[PDB]
Amino acid sequence: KIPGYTYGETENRAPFNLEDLKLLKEAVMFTAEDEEYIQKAGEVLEDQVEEILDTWYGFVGSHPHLLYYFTSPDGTPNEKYLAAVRKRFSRWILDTSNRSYDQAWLDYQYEIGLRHHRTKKNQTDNVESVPNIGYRYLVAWIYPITATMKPFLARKGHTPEEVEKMYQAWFKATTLQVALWSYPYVKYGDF
Amino acid sequence: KIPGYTYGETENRAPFNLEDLKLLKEAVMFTAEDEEYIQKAGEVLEDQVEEILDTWYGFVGSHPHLLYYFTSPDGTPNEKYLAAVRKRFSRWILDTSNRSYDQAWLDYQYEIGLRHHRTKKNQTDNVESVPNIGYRYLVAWIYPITATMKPFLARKGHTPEEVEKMYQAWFKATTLQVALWSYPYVKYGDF
Ligand code: HEM
Ligand code: HEM
């Protein structure tokens, strides 16, 4: 059990459906081939999820304007917030790799969007923190979340081009999701 | 002259400044090393800019829901629109490589955002087309605009490690810009 992790039990239907997903997957050049390799990436990443998260949390920790989004109103880091989110963030690596991308998947993407946005931020862990994460930074994180992953994908001794195929799947999957999470941020009708 | 290309003469000020850019550059892990390598990418790409646009326009052309954003009301591609945008799109490759990322640069990023958004779309070329490019697809394009560039960066005979450095600079620069272009799409206060 992971506190706050409500995959498959959301209680809002995403405003996007499988037809939206098909066309967005096309925009990001994700095909049947990538499903194979994202799943392959999951087998490779399963044991390293703690290292990856340390890398990501280290990036957060070293940037005051990034750590800021986890802070209590007095500017100090909320330790409980960081730790609770970490378990769901870590699980997300595996969900990205293992889940079928169906309507339950989409409904969670919407939920994750809401949690970054002022709509639901700080509700999941019942914490008091900054109200909203500026959208500029979710798009910006496509880079670190994609690029810092690559080394971990090579850690099971796979062939240069196999690593490359897992990386590309990961790059597309990260981009695809961030695009979906923009929904609560974007003016109604502009998404 | 490039019709509709108003870099340095937008006479609207960006709602983001150099301090915002510093913090966004940090989010995207863009440093002085990347300024060197983005500049080097420009030298490599200068000669290849038409074949690059052929590739991107080839992607647009094979997906009806993408070609869509360049269509006249009858659903056929507006040829005047594609051709005029192609010149500004091709110049943007070199601007990304060659310009100082200063307030003049930021002001144009804001203009480019306005041009994909319903605020200014179709005004520059005085064309009749669809009102808005769904923001979901700008984020999504981070993938093809980044990944399809990579082979072009290798055509000047550079080593794979130098190509890798130009490619990483290009990936960060693309992500960085798309993040900025979200401004007119994001609910005020949520960017
Ligand atoms: C590629 C971009 C990003 C990815 C892949 C990502 C991933 C995630 C995931 C998987 C969760 C947990 C979702 C759940 O509750 O199940 C989460 C929540 C969270 N993330 Fe992000 N995120 C991104 C952008 C950012 C940025 C830029 C920040 C700023 C530091 C950030 C800070 C946070 C915070 C504070 C939460 C907890 C939100 C809440 O109160 O529920 N994230 N993120
Ligand atoms: C990484 C994402 C993208 C990049 C780097 C990019 C780049 C550009 C550039 C440089 C221009 C010309 C700007 C100027 O006026 O000087 C432009 C305009 C345009 N682009 Fe994009 N673009 C992206 C996303 C998209 C998407 C997803 C579409 C959908 C097909 C699209 C279609 C168009 C259209 C229709 C225009 C003309 C807008 C107008 O009427 O002024 N772009 N883009």
A36-39 own/partner pairs: CB under 8 Å, 24+ apart = A37/A165, A37/A166, A37/A168, A37/A169, A38/A96, A38/A97, A38/A166, A38/A169, A38/A170, A38/A173, A39/A97, A39/A98
Q: Which residues of A touch B132 (CB under 8 A)?
A: 189-190
Handedness of CA B56, B182, B22, B17 (dihedral sign): positive
Q: How many CB atoms lie within 10 A of CB B49?
A: 17
Smallest Cα–Cα separation from A87: which of A150, A170, A1, A171?
A: A1
Smallest Cα–Cα separation from A139: which of A121, A105, A116, A120?
A: A116
Gap from CA of A95 to ligand 2 centroid (Å)? 32
A72 exposure class (CB count in 10 Å sphere: 0-12, 13-18, 19+):
middle
Structure tokens at A28: 């990001």
Q: Are B108 and B92 in contact (CB under 8 A)?
A: no
Smallest Cα–Cα separation from B151: which of B65, B48, B59?
A: B48
Structure tokens at A83: 């730790």
CA distance A65 to chain B (A): 7
Q: DSSP labels for A9-69?
A: --SS--S--HHHHHHHHHHTT--HHHHHHHHHHHHHHTTTHHHHHHHHHHHHHT-HHHHGG
Distances (CA, A) of A57 to A54, A83, A144, A167, A171: 5, 10, 11, 21, 19
Smallest Cα–Cα separation from A96: which of A10, A187, A180, A3?
A: A180
Q: Are A138 and A181 in contact (CB under 8 A)?
A: yes
Distances (CA, A) of B183 to A135, A184, B55, B109: 9, 14, 28, 10
Q: Which residue, among A16, A25, A28, A62, would best test binding to B if mutated, counting the most B CBs under 10 Å from its CB?
A: A28
Distances (CA, A) of B169 to A121, A159, A186, B55: 32, 25, 28, 20
| Helices and strands (H and E) in chain A: how many | 9, 0
Structure tokens at A164: 């490359």
Annotate B5-43 with b (16+ C-beta within 10 A) or e (fewer). Answer: bebeebeeebebeeebbebbbbbbbbeeebbebbebbbe
Tell me, using a 6 A CB cutoff, whether residue A69 lines ligand 1: yes
Q: Are A114 and A107 in contact (CB under 8 A)?
A: no
A188 backbone φψ class: left, alpha, beta (φ>0; ψ -120 to 50): beta
Q: Are A73 and A129 in contact (CB under 8 A)?
A: yes
- Distance of alpha carbon A154 from alpha carbon A187, whole angstroms: 40
Sequence-ordered list of residues with C-beta below 8 angstroms from that of B66, at least 6 positions apart, any chain: A26, A27, B59, B60, B137
Structure tokens at B108: 């144009």
Which single residue is written with the structure tokens 């990034």?
Answer: A66
Single-letter amino acid code for the residue at B108:
Y
Q: Are A15 and A183 in contact (CB under 8 A)?
A: yes
Size (chain B), residues: 191
> Of all helices (H) and strands (E), which one includes residue B26?
helix B18-27
- Distance of alpha carbon B118 from alpha carbon B185, whole angstroms: 9
- Distance of alpha carbon A26 from alpha carbon B140, whole angstroms: 9
- Picking from A140, A171, A180, the nearest residue to B179 by CB comes out as A140
- Distance of alpha carbon A27 from alpha carbon B63, whole angstroms: 8
Method of determination used here: X-ray
Residue of chain A whose alpha carbon sits nearest to that of B118:
A190
Question: What domains are there in chain B, each with its CATH number?
Answer: 1-191 (1.10.490.10)
State whether A135 and B186 contact (CB < 8 Å): yes
Ligand 2 neighbours, Cβ below 6 Å, are B 4-5, 60, 66, 69-70, 85, 88-89, 92, 112, 115-116, 121-122, 124, 133, 137-138, 141-142, 145, 174, 178
- Distance of alpha carbon B68 from alpha carbon B75, whole angstroms: 7
